[PDB]
Amino acid sequence: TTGRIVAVIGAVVDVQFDEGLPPILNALEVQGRETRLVLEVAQHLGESTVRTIAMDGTEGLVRGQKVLDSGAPIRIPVGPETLGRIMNVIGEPIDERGPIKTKQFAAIHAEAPEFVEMSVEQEILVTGIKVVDLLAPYAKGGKIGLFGGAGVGKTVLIMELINNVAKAHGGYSVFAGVGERTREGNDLYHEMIESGVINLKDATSKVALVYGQMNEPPGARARVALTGLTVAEYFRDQEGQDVLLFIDNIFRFTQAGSEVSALLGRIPSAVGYQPTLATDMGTMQERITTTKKGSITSVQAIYVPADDLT
Amino acid sequence: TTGRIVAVIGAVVDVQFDEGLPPILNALEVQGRETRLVLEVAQHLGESTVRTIAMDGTEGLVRGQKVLDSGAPIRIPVGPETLGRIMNVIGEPIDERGPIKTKQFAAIHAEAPEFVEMSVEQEILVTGIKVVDLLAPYAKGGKIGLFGGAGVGKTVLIMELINNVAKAHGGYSVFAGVGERTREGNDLYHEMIESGVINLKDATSKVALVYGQMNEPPGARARVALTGLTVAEYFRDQEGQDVLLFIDNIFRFTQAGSEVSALLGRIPSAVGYQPTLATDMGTMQERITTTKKGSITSVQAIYVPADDLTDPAPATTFAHLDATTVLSRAIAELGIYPAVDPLDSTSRIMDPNIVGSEHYDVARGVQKILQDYKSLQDIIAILGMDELSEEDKLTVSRARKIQRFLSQPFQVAEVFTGHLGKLVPLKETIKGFQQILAGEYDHLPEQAFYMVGPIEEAVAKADKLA
Amino acid sequence: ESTTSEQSARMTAMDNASKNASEMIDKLTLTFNRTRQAVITKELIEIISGAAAL
Amino acid sequence: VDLEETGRVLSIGDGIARVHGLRNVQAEEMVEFSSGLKGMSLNLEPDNVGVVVFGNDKLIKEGDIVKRTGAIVDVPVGEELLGRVVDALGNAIDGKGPIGSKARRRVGLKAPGIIPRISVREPMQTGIKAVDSLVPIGRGQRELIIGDRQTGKTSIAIDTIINQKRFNDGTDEKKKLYCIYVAIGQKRSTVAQLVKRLTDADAMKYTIVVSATASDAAPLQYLAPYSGCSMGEYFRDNGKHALIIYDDLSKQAVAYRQMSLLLRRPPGREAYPGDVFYLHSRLLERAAKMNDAFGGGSLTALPVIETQAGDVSAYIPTNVISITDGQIFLETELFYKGIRPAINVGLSVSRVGSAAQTRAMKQVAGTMKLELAQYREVALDAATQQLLSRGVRLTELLKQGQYSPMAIEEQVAVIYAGVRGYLDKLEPSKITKFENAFLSHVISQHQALLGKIRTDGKISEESDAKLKEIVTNFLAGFEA
Amino acid sequence: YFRDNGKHALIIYDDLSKQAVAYRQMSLLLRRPPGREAYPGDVFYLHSRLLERAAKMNDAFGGGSLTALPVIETQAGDVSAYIPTNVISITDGQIFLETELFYKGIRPAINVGLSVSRVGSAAQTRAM
Amino acid sequence: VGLKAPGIIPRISVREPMQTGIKAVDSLVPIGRGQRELIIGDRQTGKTSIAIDTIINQKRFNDGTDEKKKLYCIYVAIGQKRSTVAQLVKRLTDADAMKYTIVVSATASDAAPLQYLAPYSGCSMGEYFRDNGKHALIIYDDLSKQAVAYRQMSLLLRRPPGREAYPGDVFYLHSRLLERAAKMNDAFGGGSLTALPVIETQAGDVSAYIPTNVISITDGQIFLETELFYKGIRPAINVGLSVSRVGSAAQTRAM
């Protein structure tokens, strides 16, 4: 049913509901705006009020504005129709190439494979790249830290990875740009087209793109990885694939957290981060793994604050 | 009369009395459990409610549940019918040897010895531990502090002292274990029954035991330091006797404070500690003292968190001692036990007029060469020994011997050192160094002085190598 | 001889001196960061604290 | 209508649900939610009750029914849990049926007092040469396993668990040891492999695995080591012997810090609560050795702590060090070099357990601790260059592969080989080749000698001369 | 404006550290949760909204361009502090200037080792 | 107690030599009547055996005729242990100096506001001696412990905490107290109040909130340093780092 805006401080909105109450983690959709302003439920406050973080700017909300509960968390399209497309944190296509026409949707939040679903085997997902496969081989369903900044091959090492795991295994890939710079995001788009792995003609496209750019609010940057995760999950779980999840870049994923968490004004932990730090990270990193059905293996770029590995 | 639990959190509970209201400090008594659950009023919140610190687990309590005022503080057995018995924080006995039938009682809280009662009696107390004696001697009826980070050997050192001191000692000793290892207690007990300071057969026992270890609630750790306090207090006053008070670990007292200060509702102070760290301490601390009447020689082991000697806890405590021994991981890691920092341990009686300016002179002479070595410490680390001037090449070698001859194999860790437990008398302490200092020994290998008794065992060792 | 056994000698003492130097550096860089994090927090704890007290 | 054995939720926010109702509910009583979710009365305030949730607090909507249960928080304990993987509430997550637990324990027990106890006397055998010789543990003792990330901390626990097969498949009942592994904050992937590996060594049968993994709600991880501790007290308290491994306490402390900070409690060193020492001291006291008056059973504890850049004087490492009865320090450097287990023999210590060392070992052991001693600084004339040679060799001897605990006598055997210096003229690269051959040899043929060294519990004058001949000829047989 | 009318603008924000300070002040007096250095949780979002607004419009949009040189004051050279960190993160290059360089003679005092532009060669004429 | 300090006019440049009888101090950092000279240093460096050696020096002048060279001494003892306050009085008494010397003592066990107040009280007592044409030397030992006390009151009073938990005015605290020492001008008695405040540092850290405050306040200071101490330089002073903001204007033309 319908609720109402009762406070808007910054990118955190408080919303009253008369009858039902949307669970934590639900997607409310603020009404009467040119562009979809989703709010995501953070706390139940009492007095039929919930708190939320905004998946986009809040200018021009008035207290009293109608808000409509969608009855689920954020849901996004999934399946092969995402390959070649560029969707934002809430599933909207942003490549101006029309809509992402799929039957299936999926909730971005979700739970780690159950203990009984975990595969206990460890085998190498082969990249066909000599350096890697020989000395520091990627493990099916493992996470890989990828160091060094610009001009070292990073963009290409990715593309060639997207390419081979596709070629020699039949594994699509998702790239999650957590805090992508709008410039580089454009460029990364074209480079993937120019190179092969995206194809605007046939459907032989091999990589879905999810971007949560640097000028979106904390909420969006903080949840964009999960969107990318969700898209990859469809390929593991429904199509039994050995998938690739690129996250660039994981430090911004943490920061987005640390931000969102200071906005709900939870007291900050050591050195600035969220008190949620460990489990924020855990409940994402734990979805990435080998299940009986298949496996998401993920390469994640890392920034090291202050060159301080500690 | 009667009142009720209206709020419970951790060891902090809120009771409501409609009729009457207990003074701040009155032990309350929870009515409804198979276990004496003393509360202790610490605040009047108003609206005829008080705030209290438990003295045990509070699982179970309910909003409701009755409480009876005891009309008094927490009061415990005192007197000679305690010697040989292990008692907990509220006096209850815990050596499973029946009750402690005793004439009188005392409360755990108590005002502290007025200025007129102080005594300036400064006489040296020899330990037979070379570093302590030579550089910062303990004083009879003095307050003594053992500072150390996790694992540098406070507990061993307190034990060695208990041995070289309280074994041949006509007089009562009290040992308060405050929030340390329960198995260390079991260990003490047995070790003192065999040696026979405690005797289950008689009333010939010379020691009282008070224990509240690192498994009990904040409240309990908070207070027990005082239980054992009160006991020693009696033996001093109503007996004008020679009391030996050993605590391990006085730190856990301030720590436990911290754990409760949070929910008592004080605003946090530096580093998160209780606002009241200096007085909370200082009251408690200033009761541990030698007065005109009796005489307490106190020895408190003081834990230092994260090795931070500036952490408020260790930091504040320094004020309260007459002799201090500070233990450094740095030293211990070089196998130099006991791990005493020679340039950081001090006594308020290293004074020629008190120790005789041969002592004071060999001391500050060691303390000098050491602190001269310590200054070169930097250039030796970057350029190497060779860049050292000739004079300086020596200052090292000699110093390094001193460094090594302050090591002394304790009669306890005969198990870790394997080596036979030595105890060196003030004379041969002062002597040996004097010689080392006057360089009679620049012809002996370093090791020769590591882990020995008098300087003979040194020169003696040097041969068995050759 | 002497100035082959001296050149060779200090070529070595230097090699060493600099290795030592290089360790001090790493060990020191290490406490630097510890001190670094500590300070960040100690300041944030002082803010949060006085901000709760209103 | 009911407001006394019941509540509905006021607010469910920073992981505390404030409930209204539950009048009679007591401090630390497990309440229950609509969902099936369980929680914990923690805060008893006038109008509301603060409940810690033991699960995912998204499910907790405003105004949900909340029933009491009158049970102080407790887990299932008992022989029935062996072989099973369970969450921190005891539920089975291993899909193998349900657990026919019959007993229950408060996760929040107090520890045995000064009296019900007694000095650790009996061996807890890791089956790891280095530990068993130079850092002997003893049943009832607490030994800290502490090192940087990926230095072999867990491997050590895992081997120790795997080793207890040889006693449980044995005829002697006072040598049996039941195993309890608590996973706090680790990858679920990892617990699962850990479990399979245990299952291949046929060690799972005597083992309980309690998992609160990285994706589980903080209080679950905050809880687990205590749940597990209870499960293992049952064995201590009915005159049996258990070993519990907490992997790791560093991550639990972290979880606890989340809860503390979120409940607005006051931060200190590293933003930890003031009571983060208590959090650990009270879990690790609950392990010790009972005098025969209470069945002389024992709980032994190997808690794990993850240092950052080798800093064993942070807040959390010194806390735990100041609780336990010594520690095995693992060193990233050593590990890198190839010394594995990467134990810092000079820094690692066991206090109490010194006297729980088997006699057989003690002979040859003590004389290794000593030569390795005179190796550490001397690290040139005949004897000092000798003291080196001897050293680099004794060192090589203590390197040992994963998943292969050694029988204590098999150990005393291959150590004997080095302390009498048969290893001295072998180049060190070859030392481990030699060791593996030599050991598998005496094991195959001389089951006689081994069986006897265990029995005389000592290297007998005969044993010795027998052994001399074995090794002396075997190392002529060593061609390169 | 110029950007969107096929023209070319350059904007200098001197000094983006002092703007942060101001925004902080408003956030604090508004009683909004303090974080590191007491800055809000949106003091990144602040600057990233702003600086992501410089761009190079493809032909179909005028061909125009806005180019931004933000200016950050660092303290004792700490480029890991909250604001530096943020901006350095948002932007695609840094020109670091140093006082020792300055007095040694290097003026302009550009540390050419630390300085960088991720656009790089592509922004350069062939001669250069 | 709550008296504000002498403004601008009631005073005159500090000209009157306040002798310590310590070669080190009296030559390189000379104090003068009306000056505030801070003694700062790590614990057990000799911070007190300064202030004591100085009162014990005033025998000479107080057992004579010249009525200007006379100096009555107050000695606040904040935070210490009675076992010491006493042992110290005993030291004074022995050397025979106790006669010209108030000794206000608020110690460890004394309540919080009692240490807060102690050094003020001990000031008023010394204000009299100056406002009535005589010469006082008050020694607060130490302000470090006092500050801590003021912090407690303040925090328990729910006054939101600042740096290192101390309250905002923790500067005002030492500022105001320490201003009350002056060199009154003739038109007001000629009387003085030299004040030796004492501060205790941690590991030498003079950045610590407090030690930096009190140094900004006093007319100079003596630093102590355990390093020099053991090195043989007793009294351990660190010349180069000790300053007297009154210079020779406070010596004899003999020194």
Ligand SMILES: Nc1ncnc2c1ncn2[C@@H]1O[C@@H](COP(=O)(O)OP(=O)(O)NP(=O)(O)O)[C@H](O)[C@H]1O
């Ligand atoms: N005894 C050994 N001999 C040779 N390699 C070993 C040995 N023990 C561990 N390793 C290797 O080192 C491991 C690191 O993880 P682990 O043994 O669980 O120690 P850890 O400090 O607990 N690491 P972590 O669980 O990520 O914190 C590898 O996966 C092994 O291949």
Ligand SMILES: Nc1ncnc2c1ncn2[C@@H]1O[C@H](COP(=O)(O)OP(=O)(O)NP(=O)(O)O)[C@@H](O)[C@H]1O
């Ligand atoms: N005086 C000593 N001589 C030789 N070895 C020692 C000595 N003291 C300690 N050790 C060794 O180091 C360990 C620490 O001893 P211990 O006295 O318990 O330190 P501690 O001050 O009590 N730290 P903790 O008890 O954990 O709060 C021992 O168990 C020994 O193996």
Ligand SMILES: Nc1ncnc2c1ncn2[C@@H]1O[C@H](COP(=O)(O)OP(=O)(O)NP(=O)(O)O)[C@@H](O)[C@H]1O
């Ligand atoms: N000039 C000196 N020559 C030799 N010894 C001295 C000298 N001055 C002081 N000492 C000794 O050094 C110790 C410390 O002196 P003290 O005045 O208490 O410094 P402190 O920093 O005030 N100590 P504390 O009050 O604990 O901070 C004494 O016990 C003296 O006997």
Ligand SMILES: [Mg+2]
């Ligand atoms: Mg101890």
Ligand SMILES: [Mg+2]
């Ligand atoms: Mg591990």
Ligand SMILES: [Mg+2]
């Ligand atoms: Mg002093």
